[PDB]
Design a protein around this ligand. Structure first.
Ligand SMILES: *[C@@H]1O[C@H](CO)[C@@H](O)[C@H](O)[C@H]1NC(C)=O
Length: 235
């Protein structure tokens, strides 16, 4: 999907206009950029066993492909090779980088494709065929889990509602920390773009059960976590 990157096509324009003249006969100049640009546009068409091929990536993965690719092209041009060898090395490289990029696209589906064990993650994906963006809703468990927090008295209580994938989700509203009781009622204790609720000098009254809802834009919360806090008198 690499050609979906504005910098690759720049490197190609500069490749033809600035590197092709000095090092390639013009009898073969526009006739080669065809083969090349279609070899780049073929990165889209891959496959690797042990999985299918979603035909989709993320910015994080596109940037690796583009980088890893343009680095070696830079190796090529830096060498100043210019014969009927230039056209050999260029495409050997063009094969190998297809391999490497294929590995990248594998790691992406295996690990970074909807990596939430719970909640709703809005993940920006790029369709490789048409180089176009869509926001994909990754849906899993409603409530992520339950945290058991034990804290000694006079220590600081720290409730964390942040997960490894919140920094990568989108359309996120604030974190809200509510307080639940027997009253059946609950009072919002905190609300902001801080993923943690810290209450200093915890007491027997601070113990109980809290809840954290990470809001999303025009939707249900991305994450809900229930904290069960209990207090010890040690120290
Ligand atoms: C729940 O308890 C708190 C403190 O005990 C109190 O402020 C609140 O009014 C209670 N809710 C009821 C009684 O509905």
């Amino acid at each position: 999907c690499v050609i979906c990157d504005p910098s690759v096509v720049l490197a190609l324009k500069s490749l033809e206009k600035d590197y092709l003249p000095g090092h390639l006969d013009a009898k073969h100049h526009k006739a080669m950029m065809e083969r090349v640009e279609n070899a780049v546009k073929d990165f889209q068409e891959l496959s690797l066993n042990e999985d299918a091929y979603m035909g989709v990536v993320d910015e994080a993965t596109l940037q690796k492909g583009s980088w890893s690719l343009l680095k070696d092209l830079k190796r090529i041009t830096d060498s100043d090779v210019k014969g009927d060898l230039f056209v050999k090395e260029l495409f050997w490289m063009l094969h190998l980088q297809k391999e490497t990029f294929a590995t990248y696209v594998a790691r992406f589906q295996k690990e970074a494709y909807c990596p939430n064990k719970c909640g709703v993650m809005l993940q920006t994906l790029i369709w490789c065929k048409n180089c176009k963006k869509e926001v994909h809703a990754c849906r899993k468990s409603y409530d992520c889990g339950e945290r058991n927090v034990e804290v000694p008295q006079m220590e600081d209580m720290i409730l964390d509602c942040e997960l490894n994938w919140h920094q990568a989700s989108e359309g996120l509203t604030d974190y809200s920390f509510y307080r639940v009781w027997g009253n059946n009622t609950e009072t919002l204790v905190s609300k902001g773009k801080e993923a943690t609720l810290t209450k200093p000098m915890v007491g027997p009254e601070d113990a109980g059960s809290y809840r954290c809802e990470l809001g999303s834009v025009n939707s249900s919360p991305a994450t809900i976590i229930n904290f069960h806090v209990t207090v010890l008198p040690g120290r």
